DNA sequence: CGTACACCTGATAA
DNA sequence: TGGAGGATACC
DNA sequence: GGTATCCTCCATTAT
DNA sequence: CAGGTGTACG
C-alpha cells in the first residue's frame, strides 16, 4: 500500500524528480558584505507522503528538518553549510544526479567550498556566489541583478551521455514524476460501451530529451511525446501487452516509493482483469471503475 | 470488436 | 519546484 | 556585533 | 501528474 524502504540509487532517482539544489543571497547591513548567504537542500511532498520523507531523514542520519511547506505538502530541508559539506556532498558525488539537476547541483557544490573557507564572508568571495548562483535554478531576482550588475554568470555545466545508472534509480524518479494511468474511453463499437486503457507515462522538461529518449531503449518499449502548450515532454507506455510484460515486472521488482506504490498496486490489479479479458463485461468494466475511483487522486 | 498511437484539457501540489 | 521574510541561536 | 540556522508562508510551472 | 478523444487498423 504505502512503500519507503531506500537504497541509494532511489534516493538519487527521487532528489533528480523531486530535489532541489538553492542559494539563497539575501542583502541585510548586518553581514559585512552587506549580504547573507545560504546553501539550500530541498524536497517537498504531498502531505499523504510524510512517512516518505522521515525516511529520507533517517537515510541522512536524522539530519536537517521536516515543516508544513504549504497547505497539503511538507519540505524536507538540510540548511546547515557544514552537514551540507559533511554528509549530502560525499553521497551526491558518489552516487550522481543524471537530469539538468546535476547542473544546479554542481554549481550548489561550488558555492559551499566557498562557504567552506568562509570566503562568502568577502566581497571577492561573495562575487564569485553571485556568479555561481546565477546560473542555478531561476537564476539572479531583480534585486540581486541590481545590486550585481557586472556579473557574468558562471557556464552552466555541459554534462554529456548520462546514462541510467541503476534500475533503483528508475523506481525513484517515476515515484515522483512518474504516473500508472487508467483510462476509460468512450467508445461506440465495444458492447460494453466504453475502452479500458491503462498507461504509464513519465513526464519531464524537454531539456532531458536525451534521458527522455532512453528510456525507450532501456525498458525496451514506450515512445516520446511533445506536449502542445510548452518545453515539456512524456515518455509513454500505452501498448498492453508491453505493459504486461515489460512496465509491471519492472516495477514489481525496483518498487515504487510513497503512496504511488498503492497506486501501481491497483494498476496491476486493472491489468489482471484485462488480461483476463473481464473488462469487456459489466461487471469487469465495473470492478475497474472502482479501483480507478480509490487510486491516484481517489485515495484516502 | 477492440486496441493503440497521436492528440487533447485540467488541476496543483511539487 | 524553487523561492521569500522575519526571528532567533550561536559565536 | 557578525554570523549561521530556524520557522512560516508563497507564485508558477513542470508535472 | 492525471484523466479524456479520434480514428486507422487487424
Ligand atoms: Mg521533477
Ligand atoms: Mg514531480
Known sequence: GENGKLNPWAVVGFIDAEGSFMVRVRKNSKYKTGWLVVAIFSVTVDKKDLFLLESLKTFFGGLGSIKKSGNST?????????????????????????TEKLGDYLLFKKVLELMGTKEHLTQRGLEKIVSLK????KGLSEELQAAFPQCVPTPRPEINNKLIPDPFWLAGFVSGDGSFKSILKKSESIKVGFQSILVFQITQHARDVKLMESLISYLGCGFIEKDSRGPWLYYTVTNFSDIQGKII??????????????????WCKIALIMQNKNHLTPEGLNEIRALKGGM???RL
Open 134 to 137: 546565477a546560473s542555478i535554478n
Open 249 to 266: 515486472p519492472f516495477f514489481h521488482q525496483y518498487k515504487i516509493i510513497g503512496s504511488k506504490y498503492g497506486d501501481y498496486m491497483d
Open 74 to 98: 511538507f519540505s524536507y530541508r538540510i540548511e546547515s553549510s557544514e552537514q551540507l559539506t559533511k554528509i549530502i556532498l560525499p553521497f551526491f558525488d558518489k552516487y550522481s544526479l543524471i
Open 296 to 298: 491516484n487522486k481517489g
